[PDB]
Scaffold this active site. Structure first.
Site, mmCIF file in Angstrom:
data_model
loop_
_atom_site.group_PDB
_atom_site.id
_atom_site.type_symbol
_atom_site.label_atom_id
_atom_site.label_comp_id
_atom_site.label_asym_id
_atom_site.label_seq_id
_atom_site.Cartn_x
_atom_site.Cartn_y
_atom_site.Cartn_z
ATOM 1 N N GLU A 41 0.832 -1.174 0.000
ATOM 2 C CA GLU A 41 0.000 0.000 0.000
ATOM 3 C C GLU A 41 0.883 1.246 0.000
ATOM 4 O O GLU A 41 1.829 1.345 0.769
ATOM 5 C CB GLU A 41 -0.869 -0.043 1.225
ATOM 6 C CG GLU A 41 -1.681 1.174 1.508
ATOM 7 C CD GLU A 41 -2.554 1.081 2.799
ATOM 8 O OE1 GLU A 41 -2.560 0.013 3.508
ATOM 9 O OE2 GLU A 41 -3.282 2.120 3.039
ATOM 10 N N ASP A 50 0.354 5.022 0.714
ATOM 11 C CA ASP A 50 -0.595 6.062 1.143
ATOM 12 C C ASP A 50 -0.092 7.399 0.704
ATOM 13 O O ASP A 50 0.777 7.986 1.347
ATOM 14 C CB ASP A 50 -0.732 6.012 2.661
ATOM 15 C CG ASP A 50 -1.408 4.799 3.101
ATOM 16 O OD1 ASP A 50 -2.325 4.323 2.380
ATOM 17 O OD2 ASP A 50 -1.085 4.325 4.175
ATOM 18 N N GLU A 56 -3.371 10.833 3.408
ATOM 19 C CA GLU A 56 -4.288 10.500 4.494
ATOM 20 C C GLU A 56 -4.416 11.813 5.254
ATOM 21 O O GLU A 56 -3.418 12.288 5.762
ATOM 22 C CB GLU A 56 -3.704 9.432 5.385
ATOM 23 C CG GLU A 56 -3.787 8.048 4.707
ATOM 24 C CD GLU A 56 -3.482 6.935 5.653
ATOM 25 O OE1 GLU A 56 -2.258 6.707 5.957
ATOM 26 O OE2 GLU A 56 -4.472 6.331 6.114
ATOM 27 N N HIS A 62 3.905 1.420 2.716
ATOM 28 C CA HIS A 62 3.761 0.204 3.487
ATOM 29 C C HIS A 62 4.124 -0.983 2.636
ATOM 30 O O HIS A 62 3.278 -1.508 1.903
ATOM 31 C CB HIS A 62 2.287 -0.050 3.952
ATOM 32 C CG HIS A 62 1.732 0.987 4.868
ATOM 33 N ND1 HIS A 62 1.488 0.718 6.184
ATOM 34 C CD2 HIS A 62 1.236 2.232 4.645
ATOM 35 C CE1 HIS A 62 0.882 1.753 6.752
ATOM 36 N NE2 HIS A 62 0.748 2.700 5.836
#
Ligand SMILES: *[C@@H]1O[C@H](CO)[C@@H](O)[C@H](O)[C@H]1NC(C)=O
Ligand SMILES: [Zn+2]
Ligand SMILES: [Zn+2]
Length: 440
Positions: free
Chosen positions: A212, A214, A217, A228
């Site tokens: 993932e 990101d 956020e 991640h």
């Protein structure tokens, strides 16, 4: 899962642009699709729910396989049920929408066509978009990110998945989420337990893991960008507390990095960079640029740095410096991540699951673009915008991540106080580094 036919599925259109070196861009005719967990799911040939509230009908769904054969996903009314609207290059997500029922949040994917997700290849490229976070308070997250899902949502792999990307199947992320109702063409009814604080959610024996990135956020108070990595970059089904992640009892015992290597300007020591009235001013729209720099300047090189720029009112704003002793720079690099986890006393499973090289391996697979809006029934979004953990001193490096009160973000409260909250994503551009804004 099967395909229900009571409500046709029509994906809202959303354009985005592909840019070339020199700054020319071509418009793509994208469409968006809501994730399958938000959908009505009913017995094939009937209106009886397979799942209601936070519990399954175990006569229709006595086991994971039978459930998948007997249960059909329906089409979505994007605006009236889900508070989702799109026009031109803009996508708006509302928090609460009341129709016959009360819907909370949404999670959308970018599609190439009506049965295929758009597979972004970000290595040696930049991803850029405009956002309006002015209507996002403490406790809410408007997230834009990438996950290593299958382009057809798992249809070719899992014949018992007859719905596919058209119905938003195949989600996975670095938390190895166990709250998904269908994973790999099986239901998740076995082991299902309802959530103690989410009337619509629960967790089953299966989770869905993948890497993932990101990108975003954020709310009006704080934002973070976070890679991640996972041991395997693509979607894998896991079982039980071995999944690790937020949904299992030992967060760190699985194959994915549930924490990531994060850069939140506030957490990294600048309290005046991002926020209302700040350098990046959340009261107005702004552009977010994210660059994925490789070791050799090509798309087959190894990921070595993640850079961030903002643009607002025509001013190009480099990312803020990290100000903690021993943790400097304004980007994500291996040396940053080692130094940050050490100072903050966080477990460094980032490196354990491959670090930036592992994140780059996921990026090389192609990744699906996710735009979502959610509140946080595990940790009240405090990790993004407050002190976390809430017992810790705010003077300790790593604890304070924004100015939200430690009692903010309780979902019951967030749902009640901000049903009207919304986010707007727009004007997505992807291309070679420097190609999408006044660089560099
Ligand atoms: C925060 O970042 C802004 C923009 O980079 C900078 O001008 C200001 O000095 C920074 N504050 C601190 C404490 O470093
Ligand atoms: Zn009936
Ligand atoms: Zn909620």
């Amino acid at each position: 899962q099967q395909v229900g036919t009571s409500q046709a599925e029509v994906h809202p259109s959303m354009t985005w642009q592909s840019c070339t070196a020199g700054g020319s861009c071509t418009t793509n005719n994208g469409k968006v699709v809501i994730d399958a967990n938000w959908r009505w799911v009913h017995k094939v040939g009937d209106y009886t729910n397979c799942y209601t509230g936070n519990t399954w009908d175990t006569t229709i769904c006595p086991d994971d396989a039978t459930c998948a054969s007997n249960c059909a996903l329906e089409g979505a009314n994007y605006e009236s049920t889900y508070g989702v609207t799109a026009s031109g290059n803009s996508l708006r997500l509302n928090f609460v929408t009341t129709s016959q029922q009360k819907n909370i949040g949404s999670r959308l994917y970018m599609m190439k066509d009506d049965s295929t997700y758009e597979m972004f290849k970000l290595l040696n490229q930049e991803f850029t978009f405009d956002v309006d976070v002015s209507n996002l308070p403490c406790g809410l997250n408007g997230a834009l990110y990438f996950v290593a899902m299958d382009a057809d949502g798992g249809m070719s792999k899992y014949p018992t998945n007859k719905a596919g990307a058209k119905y938003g199947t195949g989600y996975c992320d670095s938390q190895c989420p166990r709250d998904l109702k269908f994973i790999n063409g099986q239901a998740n009814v076995e082991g299902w337990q309802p959530s103690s604080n989410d009337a619509n959610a629960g967790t089953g024996n299966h989770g869905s893991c993948c890497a993932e990135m990101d990108i975003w956020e954020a709310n009006s108070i704080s934002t973070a960008f976070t890679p991640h990595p996972c041991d395997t970059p693509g979607q894998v089904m896991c079982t039980g507390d071995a999944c690790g992640g937020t949904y299992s009892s030992d967060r760190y015992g699985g194959t994915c990095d549930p924490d990531g290597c994060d850069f939140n300007s506030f957490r990294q020591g600048n309290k005046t960079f991002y926020g209302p009235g700040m350098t990046v001013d959340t009261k107005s729209k702004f552009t977010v640029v994210t660059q994925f720099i490789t070791d050799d300047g090509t798309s087959s090189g190894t990921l070595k740095e993640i850079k961030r720029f903002y643009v607002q009112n025509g001013k190009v704003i480099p990312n803020s410096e990290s100000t903690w002793t021993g943790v400097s720079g304004n980007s994500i690099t291996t040396e940053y991540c080692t130094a940050q986890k050490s100072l903050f006393q966080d477990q460094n499973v980032f490196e354990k699951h491959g670090g930036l090289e592992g994140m780059g391996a996921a990026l090389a697979q192609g990744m699906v673009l996710v735009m979502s809006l959610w509140d946080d029934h595990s940790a009240n979004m405090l990790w993004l915008d407050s002190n976390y953990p809430t017992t810790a001193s705010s003077t300790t490096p790593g604890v304070a991540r924004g100015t939200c009160d430690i009692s903010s973000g309780v979902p019951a409260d967030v749902e009640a106080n901000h049903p009207d909250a919304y986010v707007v994503y727009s004007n997505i551009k992807v291309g070679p580094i420097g190609s999408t804004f006044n660089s560099g």
